[PDB]
Amino acid sequence: AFRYTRSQSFDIFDINQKCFVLESPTQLVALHLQGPSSSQKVRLNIALYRPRAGTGQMPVALGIKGYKLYMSCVMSGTEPTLQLEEADVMRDIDSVELTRFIFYRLDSPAEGTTRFESAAFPGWFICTSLQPRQPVGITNQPDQVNIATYKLSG
């Protein structure tokens, strides 16, 4: 279904200038990182795929640069959930199972902004809370009492 083409490292902030930090090995949080801290801003190793809903055609995997993790969407209980998984770089995404790692990168080129829609859970988008120091998650109500819009810089 998808084959790896290349990876590129990006800084990422949400539209309210929160960045990501790895709060614990399986949870990203979003916060305004101000002044100096011990807390280290997350960068993304964005792996671009080629194919061999509302889903637009830059399929990508999102690697948490320097932590050897990739974002995934899976069901937890009965609810779609964003999680972080220890995973190596995947050359082939060729199963429903592996599609958990794929998001469609949706750029608004005019505006320089980006949304990320799950391939495994179409209609679900990576989101942050309006409040700082809360988990990064997924929502089927993007940008409705959450933030699902980002600015990436390479």
Structural domain span for residue 121: 1-154
Whether the Cβ atoms of residue 102 and residue 73 lie closer than 8 Å to each other? no
Q: Which method was used?
A: X-ray
Looking up tokens 């902030």, which residue turns up? 13
CA atoms within 13 A on the CB side of 11: 8
The CATH number of whichever domain residue 56 belongs to comes to: 2.80.10.50
* Helices (H), ranges, 45-129: none
Give all strands (DSSP E) within the chain, no chain letters: 2-14, 19-24, 27-31, 43-51, 59-64, 69-76, 79-86, 92-93, 102-108, 113-118, 125-127, 134-135, 137-139, 150-153
Entry resolution (Å): 1.6
Q: Residue 115 burial (CB < 10 Å; 0-12/13-18/19+)? A: buried
Whether the Cβ atoms of residue 134 and residue 30 lie closer than 8 Å to each other? yes
* Number of structural domains found in the chain: 1
Structure-token pair, residue 48: 């671009």
Q: Return the SS3 of 19.
A: strand
How many other C-beta atoms can be found within 10 angstroms of the C-beta atom of residue 70? 21
How far is the C-alpha of 88 from the C-alpha of 109, rounded, in Å?
30
